[PDB]
Protein backbone atom coordinates (compact mmCIF):
# COMPACT_ATOMS: atom_id res chain seq x y z
CA UNK A 1 0.00 0.00 0.00
CA UNK A 2 1.25 3.53 -0.93
CA UNK A 3 2.33 5.53 2.17
CA UNK A 4 -0.28 8.39 2.00
CA UNK A 5 -0.65 8.15 5.82
CA UNK A 6 3.03 9.24 6.28
CA UNK A 7 2.33 12.35 4.10
CA UNK A 8 -1.11 13.40 5.39
CA UNK A 9 -0.50 12.51 9.08
CA UNK A 10 3.14 13.77 9.36
CA UNK A 11 3.52 15.45 12.81
CA UNK A 12 5.65 18.27 11.16
CA UNK A 13 4.83 20.11 7.88
CA UNK A 14 7.23 22.24 5.77
CA UNK A 15 7.08 26.04 5.35
CA UNK A 16 5.65 26.70 1.86
CA UNK A 17 8.89 28.35 0.58
CA UNK A 18 10.67 25.07 1.54
CA UNK A 19 7.78 22.81 0.48
CA UNK A 20 8.31 19.06 0.87
CA UNK A 21 8.01 16.51 -2.00
CA UNK A 22 7.56 12.75 -1.49
CA UNK A 23 7.81 10.49 -4.57
CA UNK A 24 5.31 7.59 -4.47
CA UNK A 25 6.01 4.61 -6.78
CA UNK A 26 5.68 0.76 -7.02
CA UNK A 27 2.66 0.52 -4.64
CA UNK A 28 -1.15 0.09 -4.49
CA UNK A 29 -2.96 3.39 -3.88
CA UNK A 30 -6.30 3.30 -2.00
CA UNK A 31 -7.55 6.90 -2.65
CA UNK A 32 -10.93 6.21 -0.88
CA UNK A 33 -9.20 7.00 2.50
CA UNK A 34 -8.98 10.55 1.02
CA UNK A 35 -12.24 10.98 -1.00
CA UNK A 36 -14.46 9.28 1.68
CA UNK A 37 -13.15 11.74 4.36
CA UNK A 38 -15.30 14.82 5.31
CA UNK A 39 -12.28 16.31 7.26
CA UNK A 40 -10.89 18.41 4.31
CA UNK A 41 -11.75 22.10 3.69
CA UNK A 42 -10.54 22.01 0.01
CA UNK A 43 -10.53 18.96 -2.29
CA UNK A 44 -10.14 19.89 -5.95
CA UNK A 45 -8.85 17.57 -8.69
CA UNK A 46 -7.58 18.75 -12.11
CA UNK A 47 -7.73 16.50 -15.19
CA UNK A 48 -8.94 13.48 -13.13
CA UNK A 49 -11.99 12.69 -10.94
CA UNK A 50 -11.18 11.37 -7.46
CA UNK A 51 -14.16 8.89 -7.76
CA UNK A 52 -12.18 7.28 -10.71
CA UNK A 53 -8.65 7.16 -9.10
CA UNK A 54 -9.11 3.62 -7.68
CA UNK A 55 -9.60 2.45 -11.36
CA UNK A 56 -6.44 4.23 -12.75
CA UNK A 57 -2.63 3.61 -13.06
CA UNK A 58 0.16 6.29 -13.09
CA UNK A 59 3.93 6.15 -13.71
CA UNK A 60 4.66 8.16 -10.52
CA UNK A 61 2.62 10.06 -7.88
CA UNK A 62 4.29 13.02 -6.15
CA UNK A 63 2.96 14.30 -2.83
CA UNK A 64 3.97 17.91 -2.05
CA UNK A 65 3.06 19.33 1.38
CA UNK A 66 3.30 22.62 3.25
CA UNK A 67 1.42 25.16 5.41
CA UNK A 68 -0.15 28.43 4.21
CA UNK A 69 -2.94 30.61 5.55
CA UNK A 70 -6.61 29.92 4.79
CA UNK A 71 -7.20 32.73 2.23
CA UNK A 72 -4.09 31.56 0.22
CA UNK A 73 -5.41 27.98 -0.45
CA UNK A 74 -7.16 29.35 -3.63
CA UNK A 75 -3.65 30.16 -5.01
CA UNK A 76 -2.82 26.40 -5.17
CA UNK A 77 -4.63 25.99 -8.50
CA UNK A 78 -3.66 26.15 -12.16
CA UNK A 79 -3.37 29.68 -13.57
CA UNK A 80 -3.48 31.43 -10.21
CA UNK A 81 -1.30 34.35 -9.12
CA UNK A 82 -0.32 35.96 -5.83
CA UNK A 83 2.61 35.77 -3.41
CA UNK A 84 2.21 31.98 -2.86
CA UNK A 85 1.72 30.95 -6.53
CA UNK A 86 4.30 33.49 -7.82
CA UNK A 87 7.13 33.15 -5.26
CA UNK A 88 6.55 29.96 -3.15
CA UNK A 89 4.71 27.02 -4.84
CA UNK A 90 3.56 27.05 -8.48
CA UNK A 91 1.31 24.47 -10.15
CA UNK A 92 1.70 24.04 -13.90
CA UNK A 93 -1.14 25.23 -16.13
CA UNK A 94 -1.46 21.59 -17.37
CA UNK A 95 -1.52 20.13 -13.80
CA UNK A 96 -3.08 16.67 -13.34
CA UNK A 97 -3.73 15.92 -9.69
CA UNK A 98 -5.54 16.82 -6.50
CA UNK A 99 -5.16 19.77 -4.10
CA UNK A 100 -6.28 18.77 -0.59
CA UNK A 101 -6.28 21.14 2.37
CA UNK A 102 -7.52 21.26 5.95
CA UNK A 103 -7.49 23.72 8.86
CA UNK A 104 -4.49 23.02 11.19
CA UNK A 105 -5.18 25.79 13.80
CA UNK A 106 -5.13 23.12 16.58
CA UNK A 107 -1.55 22.01 15.60
CA UNK A 108 0.13 25.05 14.00
CA UNK A 109 -1.12 28.12 15.98
CA UNK A 110 0.39 29.10 19.40
CA UNK A 111 -0.79 31.68 21.98
CA UNK A 112 1.59 34.64 21.39
CA UNK A 113 1.93 33.54 17.71
CA UNK A 114 3.75 30.60 16.02
CA UNK A 115 6.47 32.25 13.85
CA UNK A 116 8.09 28.96 12.64
CA UNK A 117 6.13 28.98 9.28
CA UNK A 118 7.60 31.38 6.66
CA UNK A 119 6.71 32.43 3.11
CA UNK A 120 8.71 34.30 0.49
CA UNK A 121 7.36 37.89 0.09
CA UNK A 122 9.88 39.20 -2.49
CA UNK A 123 11.51 37.64 -5.57
CA UNK A 124 13.08 39.01 -8.78
CA UNK A 125 10.89 36.71 -10.96
CA UNK A 126 8.07 34.16 -10.67
CA UNK A 127 8.78 30.46 -9.89
CA UNK A 128 8.50 27.97 -12.74
CA UNK A 129 6.05 25.12 -12.06
CA UNK A 130 7.31 22.85 -9.23
CA UNK A 131 10.39 25.08 -8.66
CA UNK A 132 11.66 25.52 -5.08
CA UNK A 133 13.67 28.53 -3.89
CA UNK A 134 15.19 28.27 -0.33
CA UNK A 135 17.69 31.18 -0.84
CA UNK A 136 17.88 34.00 1.77
CA UNK A 137 19.64 36.75 -0.24
CA UNK A 138 18.65 40.34 0.63
CA UNK A 139 16.09 41.55 -1.92
CA UNK A 140 16.89 44.86 -3.70
CA UNK A 141 13.51 46.75 -3.91
CA UNK A 142 15.00 50.09 -5.04
CA UNK A 143 17.99 51.31 -7.09
CA UNK A 144 20.70 51.29 -4.33
CA UNK A 145 22.77 48.13 -3.65
CA UNK A 146 22.18 46.09 -0.45
CA UNK A 147 25.77 44.89 0.27
CA UNK A 148 24.18 41.70 1.77
CA UNK A 149 22.33 43.53 4.65
CA UNK A 150 18.82 44.82 5.28
CA UNK A 151 18.54 48.60 4.86
CA UNK A 152 17.28 51.32 2.56
CA UNK A 153 14.96 49.52 0.11
CA UNK A 154 16.78 46.20 0.96
CA UNK A 155 14.58 43.55 2.62
CA UNK A 156 14.99 40.02 3.98
CA UNK A 157 12.88 38.03 1.48
CA UNK A 158 11.08 35.66 3.89
CA UNK A 159 8.30 36.75 6.28
CA UNK A 160 6.68 34.81 9.17
CA UNK A 161 2.94 34.02 9.28
CA UNK A 162 2.69 34.40 13.06
CA UNK A 163 -0.37 32.09 13.53
CA UNK A 164 -2.38 32.83 16.73
CA UNK A 165 -5.27 30.46 17.51
CA UNK A 166 -7.57 33.48 17.85
CA UNK A 167 -6.99 34.70 14.19
CA UNK A 168 -9.86 34.80 11.63
CA UNK A 169 -10.04 31.60 9.49
CA UNK A 170 -8.42 33.38 6.47
CA UNK A 171 -5.33 33.95 8.75
CA UNK A 172 -5.34 30.47 10.36
CA UNK A 173 -2.85 27.79 9.23
CA UNK A 174 -3.95 25.18 6.62
CA UNK A 175 -2.00 22.03 5.83
CA UNK A 176 -1.93 21.33 2.08
CA UNK A 177 -1.11 18.15 0.18
CA UNK A 178 -0.76 18.33 -3.61
CA UNK A 179 -0.93 14.90 -5.33
CA UNK A 180 0.57 14.96 -8.88
CA UNK A 181 -0.47 12.00 -11.15
CA UNK A 182 2.25 11.56 -13.78
CA UNK A 183 1.90 9.59 -17.08
CA UNK A 184 5.29 9.08 -18.80
CA UNK A 185 5.96 6.82 -21.86
CA UNK A 186 7.14 4.19 -19.27
CA UNK A 187 5.44 1.39 -17.23
CA UNK A 188 2.69 2.37 -14.69
CA UNK A 189 3.94 1.63 -11.10
CA UNK A 190 1.12 3.26 -8.97
CA UNK A 191 -2.32 1.66 -9.46
CA UNK A 192 -5.65 1.67 -7.55
CA UNK A 193 -6.91 -1.74 -6.20
Amino acid sequence: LCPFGEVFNATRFASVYAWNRKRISNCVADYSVLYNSASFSTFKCYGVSPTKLNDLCFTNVYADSFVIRGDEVRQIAPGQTGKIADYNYKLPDDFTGCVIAWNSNNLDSKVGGNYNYLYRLFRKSNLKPFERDISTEIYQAGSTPCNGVEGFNCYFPLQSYGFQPTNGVGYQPYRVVVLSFELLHAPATVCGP
Partner: antibody
Amino acid sequence: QLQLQESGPGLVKPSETLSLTCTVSGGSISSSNFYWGWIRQPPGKGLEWIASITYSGRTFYNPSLKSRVAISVDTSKNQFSLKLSSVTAADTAVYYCARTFPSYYDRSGYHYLNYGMDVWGQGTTVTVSS
Amino acid sequence: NFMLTQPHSMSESPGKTVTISCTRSSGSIASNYVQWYQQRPGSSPTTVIYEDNQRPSGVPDRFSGSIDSSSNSASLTISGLKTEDEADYYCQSYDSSSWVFGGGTKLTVLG
Protein backbone atom coordinates in the same frame (compact mmCIF):
# COMPACT_ATOMS: atom_id res chain seq x y z
CA GLN B 1 1.20 36.44 -16.49
CA LEU B 2 -1.44 35.44 -19.07
CA GLN B 3 -2.20 38.18 -21.60
CA LEU B 4 -4.98 38.03 -24.23
CA GLN B 5 -5.10 40.23 -27.35
CA GLU B 6 -8.14 40.50 -29.63
CA SER B 7 -7.84 41.30 -33.34
CA GLY B 8 -10.79 42.15 -35.58
CA PRO B 9 -11.71 44.06 -38.75
CA GLY B 10 -13.24 47.16 -37.05
CA LEU B 11 -16.10 46.97 -39.58
CA VAL B 12 -18.40 44.34 -41.05
CA LYS B 13 -21.33 44.73 -43.46
CA PRO B 14 -24.82 43.54 -42.57
CA SER B 15 -25.38 39.89 -43.63
CA GLU B 16 -21.56 39.25 -43.85
CA THR B 17 -19.54 37.10 -41.39
CA LEU B 18 -17.58 38.59 -38.51
CA SER B 19 -14.22 36.86 -37.76
CA LEU B 20 -12.24 37.70 -34.62
CA THR B 21 -9.00 36.24 -33.27
CA CYS B 22 -7.55 36.15 -29.72
CA THR B 23 -3.77 35.71 -29.40
CA VAL B 24 -2.62 34.29 -26.07
CA SER B 25 0.74 34.93 -24.43
CA GLY B 26 2.02 33.72 -21.06
CA GLY B 27 0.06 30.47 -21.37
CA SER B 28 -0.76 27.71 -23.88
CA ILE B 29 -4.14 27.49 -25.63
CA SER B 30 -3.70 23.66 -25.69
CA SER B 31 -4.00 23.37 -21.85
CA SER B 32 -6.65 20.75 -20.79
CA ASN B 33 -7.55 22.71 -17.60
CA PHE B 34 -9.08 25.86 -19.17
CA TYR B 35 -11.89 27.13 -21.41
CA TRP B 36 -11.48 30.17 -23.63
CA GLY B 37 -14.47 32.31 -24.47
CA TRP B 38 -15.96 35.41 -26.03
CA ILE B 39 -18.09 38.04 -24.26
CA ARG B 40 -19.53 41.13 -25.92
CA GLN B 41 -20.91 44.52 -24.87
CA PRO B 42 -23.05 46.63 -27.20
CA PRO B 43 -22.53 50.43 -26.84
CA GLY B 44 -23.84 51.63 -23.43
CA LYS B 45 -25.22 48.12 -22.58
CA GLY B 46 -24.37 45.06 -20.47
CA LEU B 47 -22.25 41.94 -20.96
CA GLU B 48 -23.35 38.84 -22.97
CA TRP B 49 -21.50 35.50 -23.16
CA ILE B 50 -21.22 34.09 -26.72
CA ALA B 51 -19.35 30.73 -26.49
CA SER B 52 -16.41 28.92 -24.88
CA ILE B 53 -14.09 26.15 -26.11
CA THR B 54 -11.29 23.93 -24.82
CA TYR B 55 -8.61 22.31 -27.04
CA SER B 56 -10.04 18.76 -26.58
CA GLY B 57 -12.90 20.28 -28.66
CA ARG B 58 -15.74 20.48 -26.13
CA THR B 59 -17.71 23.68 -26.87
CA PHE B 60 -20.49 25.60 -25.11
CA TYR B 61 -22.75 28.15 -26.77
CA ASN B 62 -25.24 30.88 -25.83
CA PRO B 63 -28.39 29.17 -27.14
CA SER B 64 -29.77 32.44 -28.63
CA LEU B 65 -26.64 32.93 -30.84
CA LYS B 66 -25.62 29.26 -31.28
CA SER B 67 -26.76 28.69 -34.86
CA ARG B 68 -24.62 31.71 -36.13
CA VAL B 69 -21.48 30.89 -34.06
CA ALA B 70 -18.34 28.92 -34.72
CA ILE B 71 -15.44 28.90 -32.27
CA SER B 72 -12.09 27.20 -32.88
CA VAL B 73 -8.51 26.83 -31.59
CA ASP B 74 -5.14 27.07 -33.49
CA THR B 75 -2.38 25.78 -31.14
CA SER B 76 0.60 26.57 -33.40
CA LYS B 77 -0.40 30.30 -33.39
CA ASN B 78 -1.57 30.13 -29.72
CA GLN B 79 -4.92 31.56 -30.90
CA PHE B 80 -8.64 30.98 -30.65
CA SER B 81 -11.24 32.51 -32.95
CA LEU B 82 -14.89 33.51 -33.25
CA LYS B 83 -17.04 33.42 -36.35
CA LEU B 84 -20.51 35.08 -36.27
CA SER B 85 -22.49 34.61 -39.50
CA SER B 86 -25.19 36.92 -40.95
CA VAL B 87 -24.41 39.91 -38.75
CA THR B 88 -26.98 42.65 -38.07
CA ALA B 89 -26.87 46.04 -36.28
CA ALA B 90 -27.51 44.04 -33.06
CA ASP B 91 -23.95 42.63 -33.40
CA THR B 92 -22.25 46.08 -33.06
CA ALA B 93 -20.30 45.68 -29.81
CA VAL B 94 -16.95 45.50 -28.07
CA TYR B 95 -15.90 41.84 -28.14
CA TYR B 96 -13.68 40.51 -25.33
CA CYS B 97 -11.76 37.24 -25.27
CA ALA B 98 -11.17 35.67 -21.86
CA ARG B 99 -9.79 32.56 -20.12
CA THR B 100 -12.08 30.81 -17.62
CA PHE B 101 -11.24 29.64 -14.14
CA PRO B 102 -9.81 26.11 -14.41
CA SER B 103 -12.03 23.02 -14.66
CA TYR B 104 -11.95 20.64 -11.71
CA TYR B 105 -13.69 17.80 -9.92
CA ASP B 106 -14.78 18.04 -6.26
CA ARG B 107 -14.35 15.18 -3.73
CA SER B 108 -17.78 13.72 -4.81
CA GLY B 109 -16.65 13.60 -8.49
CA TYR B 110 -18.85 16.54 -9.69
CA HIS B 111 -17.21 18.43 -12.64
CA TYR B 112 -17.04 22.25 -12.60
CA LEU B 113 -16.07 23.87 -15.92
CA ASN B 114 -16.62 27.00 -17.99
CA TYR B 115 -18.35 28.82 -15.09
CA GLY B 116 -16.68 32.27 -15.02
CA MET B 117 -13.94 34.44 -16.54
CA ASP B 118 -10.58 34.84 -14.80
CA VAL B 119 -8.36 36.76 -17.25
CA TRP B 120 -9.89 39.28 -19.70
CA GLY B 121 -8.55 40.69 -22.96
CA GLN B 122 -8.44 44.33 -24.09
CA GLY B 123 -11.60 44.24 -26.25
CA THR B 124 -11.92 44.84 -30.01
CA THR B 125 -14.62 47.26 -31.22
CA VAL B 126 -16.85 45.98 -34.05
CA THR B 127 -19.22 48.34 -35.90
CA VAL B 128 -21.78 46.85 -38.35
CA SER B 129 -21.97 49.32 -41.28
CA SER B 130 -22.63 49.59 -45.03
CA ASN C 1 -32.86 30.74 -18.62
CA PHE C 2 -33.12 32.60 -15.25
CA MET C 3 -32.61 36.37 -14.72
CA LEU C 4 -30.12 38.00 -12.31
CA THR C 5 -31.52 41.34 -11.12
CA GLN C 6 -29.19 44.08 -9.76
CA PRO C 7 -30.01 47.63 -8.73
CA HIS C 8 -29.31 49.96 -11.71
CA SER C 9 -27.50 52.66 -9.62
CA MET C 10 -26.10 53.11 -6.07
CA SER C 11 -24.29 56.00 -4.28
CA GLU C 12 -22.20 55.93 -1.06
CA SER C 13 -19.57 58.08 0.77
CA PRO C 14 -15.84 57.19 0.98
CA GLY C 15 -14.97 54.95 3.93
CA LYS C 16 -18.51 53.54 4.12
CA THR C 17 -19.79 50.13 3.05
CA VAL C 18 -21.99 49.45 0.03
CA THR C 19 -23.64 46.06 -0.73
CA ILE C 20 -24.80 45.28 -4.30
CA SER C 21 -27.42 42.49 -4.67
CA CYS C 22 -27.95 40.03 -7.53
CA THR C 23 -31.30 38.20 -7.25
CA ARG C 24 -31.82 34.89 -9.17
CA SER C 25 -35.40 34.69 -10.57
CA SER C 26 -35.63 30.81 -10.40
CA GLY C 27 -33.57 27.95 -8.99
CA SER C 28 -31.33 28.34 -5.94
CA ILE C 29 -28.65 31.07 -6.08
CA ALA C 30 -26.45 28.45 -4.26
CA SER C 31 -26.89 25.89 -7.15
CA ASN C 32 -24.20 27.57 -9.33
CA TYR C 33 -21.11 29.75 -8.65
CA VAL C 34 -21.54 33.52 -8.86
CA GLN C 35 -18.80 35.86 -10.15
CA TRP C 36 -18.54 39.64 -9.92
CA TYR C 37 -16.83 41.79 -12.58
CA GLN C 38 -15.80 45.44 -12.14
CA GLN C 39 -15.70 47.70 -15.25
CA ARG C 40 -14.44 51.30 -15.38
CA PRO C 41 -15.58 53.40 -18.37
CA GLY C 42 -13.48 52.65 -21.51
CA SER C 43 -11.75 49.65 -19.78
CA SER C 44 -12.08 45.85 -19.93
CA PRO C 45 -13.95 44.21 -17.07
CA THR C 46 -11.81 42.72 -14.27
CA THR C 47 -12.89 39.84 -12.01
CA VAL C 48 -13.27 40.86 -8.34
CA ILE C 49 -15.10 37.75 -6.94
CA TYR C 50 -15.39 34.16 -8.19
CA GLU C 51 -17.01 31.00 -6.75
CA ASP C 52 -19.35 33.28 -4.67
CA ASN C 53 -16.73 34.56 -2.18
CA GLN C 54 -13.17 34.01 -3.53
CA ARG C 55 -11.00 37.08 -4.30
CA PRO C 56 -8.41 37.04 -7.07
CA SER C 57 -4.95 38.15 -6.08
CA GLY C 58 -4.57 41.89 -6.65
CA VAL C 59 -8.19 42.51 -5.51
CA PRO C 60 -8.31 44.58 -2.30
CA ASP C 61 -9.59 42.62 0.78
CA ARG C 62 -12.40 45.15 1.33
CA PHE C 63 -14.22 43.42 -1.59
CA SER C 64 -16.16 40.41 -0.31
CA GLY C 65 -18.85 38.22 -1.78
CA SER C 66 -21.65 36.24 -0.17
CA ILE C 67 -24.87 34.29 -0.92
CA ASP C 68 -28.25 34.85 0.85
CA SER C 69 -30.53 31.79 0.10
CA SER C 70 -33.31 33.68 2.04
CA SER C 71 -33.70 36.39 -0.73
CA ASN C 72 -32.08 34.04 -3.33
CA SER C 73 -29.46 36.74 -4.00
CA ALA C 74 -25.74 37.07 -4.20
CA SER C 75 -24.08 40.12 -2.70
CA LEU C 76 -20.91 42.09 -3.34
CA THR C 77 -19.84 44.12 -0.29
CA ILE C 78 -17.33 46.92 -0.73
CA SER C 79 -16.16 48.11 2.68
CA GLY C 80 -14.02 51.15 3.15
CA LEU C 81 -15.20 52.64 -0.18
CA LYS C 82 -12.46 54.46 -2.23
CA THR C 83 -13.06 56.93 -5.07
CA GLU C 84 -11.17 54.26 -7.27
CA ASP C 85 -14.23 51.91 -6.76
CA GLU C 86 -16.48 54.06 -8.98
CA ALA C 87 -17.35 51.58 -11.73
CA ASP C 88 -20.07 49.34 -13.15
CA TYR C 89 -20.34 45.96 -11.34
CA TYR C 90 -21.86 42.89 -13.01
CA CYS C 91 -22.78 39.64 -11.34
CA GLN C 92 -22.73 36.45 -13.41
CA SER C 93 -23.79 32.83 -12.93
CA TYR C 94 -24.88 29.93 -15.15
CA ASP C 95 -26.55 26.52 -15.24
CA SER C 96 -26.29 23.56 -17.69
CA SER C 97 -28.17 25.71 -20.30
CA SER C 98 -26.19 29.00 -20.49
CA TRP C 99 -24.39 31.80 -18.66
CA VAL C 100 -26.48 34.63 -17.16
CA PHE C 101 -25.23 38.17 -16.47
CA GLY C 102 -26.90 40.67 -14.19
CA GLY C 103 -27.76 43.99 -15.83
CA GLY C 104 -24.99 45.93 -14.04
CA THR C 105 -24.94 48.42 -11.15
CA LYS C 106 -23.30 51.84 -11.61
CA LEU C 107 -21.62 52.79 -8.31
CA THR C 108 -21.09 56.52 -7.56
CA VAL C 109 -18.80 57.62 -4.64
CA LEU C 110 -20.36 60.74 -2.99
CA GLY C 111 -18.50 63.72 -1.36
